[PDB]
């Protein structure tokens, strides 16, 4: 349709995050997750904040024919109850943090 997937699925993105925002969030203390070329299905049970450090991911929501693309330097918030498929085609590295209600 005309509406972008990010708007439809409430996927907040903050492309080209400044270092100030990273330190406000305390990203340097976040856990690390990495992968190579693979395919990860996931249903988010809580919100997750992801800061991509290397590579890129294409996110295909359940039943979708389009994808959302996030690149290194982007800060992504995956919402609770989102069901999607994550696709990687090259080395990928991220720092993540899961957020409960309130929190951040």
């Amino acid at each position: 349709m005309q509406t972008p997937l990010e708007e439809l699925y409430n996927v907040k993105v903050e492309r080209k995050v400044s270092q100030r925002r990273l330190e406000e969030l305390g990203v340097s203390r976040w856990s690390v997750w990495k992968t190579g070329k693979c395919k990860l299905p996931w249903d988010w049970q809580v919100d997750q904040l992801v800061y991509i450090e290397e590579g890129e991911v294409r996110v295909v929501p359940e039943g979708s024919k389009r994808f959302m693309q996030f690149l290194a330097g982007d800060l992504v918030r995956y919402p609770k109850w989102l069901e999607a498929d994550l696709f990687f085609n090259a080395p990928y590295s991220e720092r993540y943090c899961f957020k409960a209600y309130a929190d951040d």
Partner: protein
Amino acid sequence: YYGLKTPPYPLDALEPYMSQRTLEVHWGKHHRGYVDNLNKQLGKDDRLYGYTMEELIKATYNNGNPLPEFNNAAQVYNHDFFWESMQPGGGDMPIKGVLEQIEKDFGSFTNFREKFTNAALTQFGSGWVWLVLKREERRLEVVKTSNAINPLVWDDIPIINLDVWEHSYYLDYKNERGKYINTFLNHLVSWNAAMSRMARAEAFVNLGEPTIPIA
């Protein structure tokens, strides 16, 4: 952006049941702080701007995973609704169509009063107590919600509000929430406001019965 609406009465008009100092902090500090915080958030998102107030509350509620703007947007509506739920020389009993709907949906006004009181006494922590009009069921109900939640997020039409956040009664009653509830039902609740809110709600619910031809 939203302005801070003044209550429909002077700040000392609810004395001695609700003190002037309570109104000054409750409206002048709490309600004002909610409006100011919401306006900052709306100035950064053009999409949340442009929603109506009811639409914004439903949209930011996000079907049970509320967005950061929900608490401010819900609270500004809740407090605006609350000041209009009260009037000087309020209390006693409703009349005309409000009384008949209450007697139909609760059995009697006495039954409604206990249901409203028990909901207000058993709401743990901060929250609100509502007399609502059910859209699908076409009847009145007593509902209690926690923190900033209001019946708009479930497409219900509020009729009467009571704030049971501690900041609304602690200066005048301290821990005696039951006295605060009893005073609200006896001297403050505006049944005149409920008449107009029921009239506005009847543009969407139709609590009447159809005229069916014998043909």
